[PDB]
Amino acid sequence: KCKDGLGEYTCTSLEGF
Amino acid sequence: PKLLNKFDKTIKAELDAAEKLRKRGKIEEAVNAFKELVRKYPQSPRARYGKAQCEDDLAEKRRSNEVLRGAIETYQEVASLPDVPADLLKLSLKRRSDRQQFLGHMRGSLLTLQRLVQLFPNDTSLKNDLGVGYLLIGDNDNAKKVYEEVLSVTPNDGFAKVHYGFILKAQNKIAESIPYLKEGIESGDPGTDDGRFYFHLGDAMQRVGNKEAYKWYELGHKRGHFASVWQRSLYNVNGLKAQPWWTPKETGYTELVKSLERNWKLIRDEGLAVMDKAKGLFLPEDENLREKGDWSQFTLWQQGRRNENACKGAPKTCTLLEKFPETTGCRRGQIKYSIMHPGTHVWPHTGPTNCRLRMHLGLVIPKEGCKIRCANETKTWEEGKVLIFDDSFEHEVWQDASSFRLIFIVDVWHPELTPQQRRSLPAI
Ligand SMILES: [Fe+3]
Secondary structure (H helix, E strand, C coil): CCCCCCCCCCCCCCCCC | CCCCCHHHHCCHHHHHHHHHHHHHCCHHHHHHHHHHHHHHCCCCHHHHHHHHHHHHHHHHHHCCHHHHHHHHHHHHHHHHCCCCCHHHHHHHHHHHHHHHHHCCCHHHHHHHHHHHHHHCCCCHHHHHHHHHHHHHHCCHHHHHHHHHHHHHHCCCCHHHHHHHHHHHHHCCCHHHHHHHHHHHHHCCCCCCCCHHHHHHHHHHHHHHCCCCHHHHHHHHHHCCCCCCCCECCCECCCCCCCCCEECHHHHCCHHHHHHHHHCHHHHHHHHHHHHHHCHHHCEECCCCCEEECCEEEEEEEECCEECHHHHCCCHHHHHHHCCCHHHHCCCCCEEEEEEECCCEEEEEECCCECCEEEEEEEEECCCCCEEEEECCEEECCCECCEEEECCCECEEEEECCCCCEEEEEEEEECCCCCHHHHHHCCCC
16 A cells, blocks of 8 residues: 555556446 | 458458447447347357447446446457457457456456466567556566566566566665666656656665656656656646645644644643553554664554544544544545654655645654655654645655654645545545
């Protein structure tokens, strides 16, 4: 998870439409 | 693209007719057209692929996940039919993987991509796509194994370079990651003009001391990835007011600020209580943002969700914060205690989004050694007072006191965000 920074490839989770 | 086998060529007239209906926009009429072509020619790969594309387009119109789950299956059925053209096999399975990630079935998209790589072991781009599948599920080890195979065959591929460099930088191999990032961006290959690689290349250069990091920050600003050389967040809503430092009256959350400053001692005392009787609830910073030092955090709210066990350790503070949805409902921010011990220096970094403003409540602030810089201005905390800054701007923290520094972090929605946006934005 991206909290104080941005070290992940994606910071969100896909759940469809 | 050769997509018709021998048998499909004999029925190219009926296939092109239904394909026109799909292209014209009669998705409902085209679905039933390919559906009967499949019923009439149950081994036609194109008629099965045409049924899958109609279900795909229909799932877009109806915004249905159940319809998309049906297309995902039909895309797999084209692979079971006999004498399927190689180009049709790649397109039918690649679309299945893409739609599987859209629904969040990340583990399923990995299996589909593994089948494609086993079917076409010479396609470099398919291996690169399999590496992205591992990076979306969190398996950086297997992603590194894939991009190593690509660079052993095609060492000039920039897509594999930027992803190999991203993994090395994630594994704290800062110096080794720079050449893979700088060369992959400069390769100009499709997929290398992503703001993520500009962000991590400039960050990697900043930690090693290369001043040319800002030349890469300005280049990302010119190509539209960063709002500025200072505000380098990537999950952004366009139009929001951008300034590194805010005042309480500017944010409009004046009721929240006063509740925090009027009751700051009870917030401090409940945090120190966790320090003295439950050190386990303070977890170390796990985002590699530290050059050195001890920095732990005790989170109460995260992604708009309340940790019941954490609110059992600070009950009065959770009850106080319960009255303000501007922070408890911020699904792109947290509410946490932050303890930082002497000898600590946090690297210059940027928050993931511009949709939140970050508040700092001074709880236990040593009289010297503590200072925080946002953009080009450095400020210090004060006990019982609230600092407000936009953490989407580059900020940096030092702690060089003789005792610990304890503050309270409260993230709020950006005030200029509409309530419809506050309810729709995906959580971070
Ligand atoms: Fe930060």
